[PDB]
A paper describes a structure:
GRASP55 is a medial/trans Golgi molecule that is involved in Golgi stacking, Golgi fragmentation during mitosis and the unconventional protein transport triggered by cellular stress. The cargo receptor function of GRASP55 was attributed to the interaction of GRASP55 PDZ domains with motifs in the C-terminal part of cargos such as CD8, TGF-α, or CD83. Members of the Junctional Adhesion Molecular family exhibit a similar structure with two extracellular immunoglobulin domains, a single transmembrane region and a C-terminal PSD-95/Discs Large/ZO-1 (PDZ)-binding motif. We demonstrated that GRASP55 interacted with the PDZ-binding motif of JAM-C in testis.
Therefore, we co-crystallized GRASP55 PDZ domains with peptides corresponding to the C-terminal 19-mer of mouse JAM-B (JAM-B_P19) and JAM-C (JAM-C_P19). The bound structures of GRASP55 with an uncleaved 6xHis-Tag crystallized in the I4122 space group and contained 2 molecules in the asymmetric unit. Notably, GRASP55/JAM-C and GRASP55/JAM-B structures exhibited an unexpected ‘closed’ conformation that was characterized by a 33 degree rotation angle of PDZ2 towards the PDZ1 domain and a 12.1 Å root mean square deviation (rmsd) after superimposition of PDZ1 domains to the previously reported structure of the ‘ligand-free’ GRASP55 PDZ domains. The cargo bound conformation may be preferentially selected in the presence of C-terminal JAM peptides. These structures indicate that JAM-B_P19 and JAM-C_P19 bind to a groove on the PDZ1 surface, and C-terminal residues penetrate the conventional hydrophobic cavity found in this PDZ domain. Most of the observed interactions occurred via the last four residues of JAM-B_P19 or JAM-C_P19, where the carboxylate group of Ile0 is coordinated by a network of hydrogen bonds to the main chain amide groups in the “carboxylate binding loop” of GRASP55 PDZ1. Residues at positions 0 and -2 are inserted in an extended conformation and present supplementary hydrogen bonds with the 5th β-strand, which adds a 6th antiparallel β-strand to the conventional structure of the interface. Following the nomenclature for residues binding to PDZ motifs, the JAMB_P19 peptide C-terminal Isoleucine residue was designated Ile0 and subsequent residues toward the N-terminus were negatively decreased Ile-1, Phe-2, Ser-3, Lys-4, Thr-5, His-6, Lys-7 and Phe-8. Notably, one very unique feature and non-conventional interaction of GRASP55/JAM-B_P19 was the positioning of Arg101 at a close distance from the interface, which allows hydrogen-bonding interactions with PDZ2 domain amino acids (such as Ala139) and Thr5 from JAM-B. Measurement of the relative binding of GRASP55 to JAM family members using homogenous time-resolved fluorescence (HTRF) or isothermal titration calorimetry (ITC) revealed five- to seven-fold higher affinity interactions of GRASP55 with JAM-B and JAM-C (4.9 μM and 3.7 μM, respectively) as compared to JAM-A (27 μM).
Numbering used by the authors:
A (entry chain A), C (entry chain A): -14 to 208
B (entry chain D), F (entry chain D): 14 to 19
D (entry chain B), E (entry chain B): -15 to 208
G (entry chain C), H (entry chain C): 12 to 19
């Protein structure tokens, strides 16, 4: 040809994308996305991995709807063990973990896990890597930190579409809360960022953004 | 949706 | 403090951002953004730099409006020299270049320069670096190439806002044309890309995107 | 110099970077035991020793300024009862005391179940090599290196000096060469046997990309 | 090996990467004159010689397999009339003939006004070091290195082997050390005198970041 | 706006 | 002069 | 063995 480029093989995480889709019992492709997992929690003891784990079923009941069922089932079985079916966007596998919701641990909630109902379709692909961060930038003041932090969304507030750059087209004046994963803590946290295109520097956050295979949340070599 | 604690 | 981070000094391009703004004669902050410059053209001979140059005035006439004036003035002075006032987003300086519009050169137009009317405010900041590119991806088939190409917009089509990720929320089925800068050719080109979130891989283009100081269009050390 | 088209700007960087520090450690010295791999369900794990970032400097008041049998001997003597270790963090640049109970009663290698190495902690956060892209069937690929998740934090060596990653790879060009590799998912070290080959059939001699610098450090949490 | 959490995927890479090529050049050999800096308004510039990517292999049919005075002598003899040069591109992996007219009549150094160096063009596109971030008042900063725009493509040397960037910087730790640096804005080479200092007061010994690999090559246009 | 050639 | 990893 | 840049 005339093209100065050719194809080559490279290693990429299995958690892509787009080799799909769903062998989940009860059908569906949606579950409860596990965000923040508090320390010394039932969730922690149960092995719930932030970002990578989706709760799909609890005691055989499929959770394909965003309702109070999950809360009710946990409420009804407080201080007793419940078995949860979990899907991993990392390993693309399903696993059953026992967990005991409780008030007897010093933390918020029965499981101590921040969750959100969405689909696990390519969930590993909707991540934005925080690159450099200027001093006294909106990003800096909010708590975003260079290279260690990954924005995985979102906090809605809410209507049509709206993922990150197409989020920050709104809120240009007013506050915005994000879900941020940190590769040191290996956990999610919620940060209040307020955009300002005239903050006195780069962009509206004053930070760099990476998207793609070079900017995913890291994966161990073997399961 | 929106995120919540369980 | 408790923060595990501190501030440090780093070199960044002067073409930032946000040290501003405008000392331009006739006032205003808008001009004609120089995109593609054809080879062996009046534009080329005149020294018009793709992406970095904005045409601000021609023979003393300020071009702060998107009208047929620039075309008319070139038409009226065909085969004669005209002096243009040019602003560089690279050097933040104003310079006068002589140029002779002509039909006698084998190319499209009198100057042989693709332009667009917009503002040079932080124009160096609205750039998206094409990172990795999958085989047979929408990005690949369109002509986007890894690391050498920078998407600088846009092609509108058109109404409110809409910069890149917030562009590709539309066209998910249908075609989309982009302005792409290449650091080898040091020139812009127009590429027809058609998004497909189910193309069979990463994202909707099948490429990586970089934004920020680490992903700007490169600048020489001295003017 | 003409007029530079560049200027200076402020950016956030980890505390553990870019200064002159021989540190404020009690007992003097600047060397300790670098904590590499920490086995799961181990005394070491329970004690809170984090891989790469932690250096053991003292144990029960005894400063560890020598690569000798003192550390194991002390652990042997206090087996199954608690021992106090003074630990320095290259992450927080602070010193902390952790209690730990060495044991034979746990099913794992060692009394603590912790891989260590005696070296200096000055700028230890800077001697990291970030593994970028990795070609198929490359030396890097076959060895076990994985893109972006792995960081090379040094090597087990032949008395090759200085061993910065690259000056190893053309010396070991015939046969391995062992590396110590940190992974940000597991947050733990592992040993990788790689065999370099400039004619392997692709990029470089490992068939992977390498990053060095602030953009390629082992990530650190926002707060201590 | 268990089940790897990684798989193989196809990606676009430059033609000038990752194969075994001693090339198809007429006259044999695998070495030529690497075109570094090309002065503006020069015969060389007019002839279309692009810095870094071009190697002069033959001139008027004479193969240049030796670092001798042949090239200048031939240029001297044909001064002010056209000469034919066979040029190999590491970019396109193709050979092309360019006419060029050496002259004394132009106000610049040389007959062609082109900095060259005799070496091999096998995988020459791989021996590039991408300059990433650059700290203020760093050795890199003071020397003239600039972030992301500059690529180190080798060094002028003391008979230090192999000189991969890093194994130079601890050997030259006292005083410079000269580097050849490509810039993607100017698309041209320049010589930079840097003085390494591991105790300069910051990151590494240059105070800059370094990238190596497909993510850090000198950029190439989509079509030849 | 939209881009055009001059 | 160079040590080498060992387990404790 | 190593050459060094020169101008032509």
């Amino acid at each position: 040809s005339t093209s100065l480029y050719k194809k080559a093989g490279f290693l990429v995480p299995r958690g892509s994308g787009s080799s799909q889709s769903v062998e989940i019992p009860g059908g569906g492709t949606e579950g409860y996305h596990v965000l923040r997992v508090q320390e010394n929690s039932p969730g922690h003891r149960a092995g719930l991995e932030p970002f990578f784990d989706f709760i799909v079923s609890i005691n055989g009941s499929r959770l394909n709807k965003d309702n109070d069922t999950l809360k009710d089932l946990l409420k009804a079985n407080v201080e007793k063990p419940v078995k949860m079916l979990i899907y991993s966007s990392k390993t693309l596998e399903l696993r059953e973990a026992s967990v005991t919701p409780s008030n007897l641990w010093g933390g918020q909630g029965l499981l101590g896990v921040s969750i959100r109902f969405c689909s696990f379709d390519g969930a590993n692909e909707n991540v934005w890597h925080v690159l450099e961060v200027e001093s006294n930038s909106p990003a800096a003041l909010a708590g975003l930190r260079p290279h260690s932090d990954y924005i995985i969304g979102a906090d809605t507030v809410m209507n049509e579409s709206e993922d990150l750059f197409s989020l920050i087209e709104t809120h240009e004046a007013k506050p915005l809360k994000l879900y941020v994963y940190n590769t040191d803590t290996d956990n999610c946290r919620e940060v209040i960022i307020t955009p300002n295109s005239a903050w006195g520097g780069e962009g509206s956050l004053g930070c760099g953004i990476g998207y793609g295979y070079l900017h995913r949340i890291p994966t161990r070599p073997f399961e | 949706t929106k995120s919540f604690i369980i």
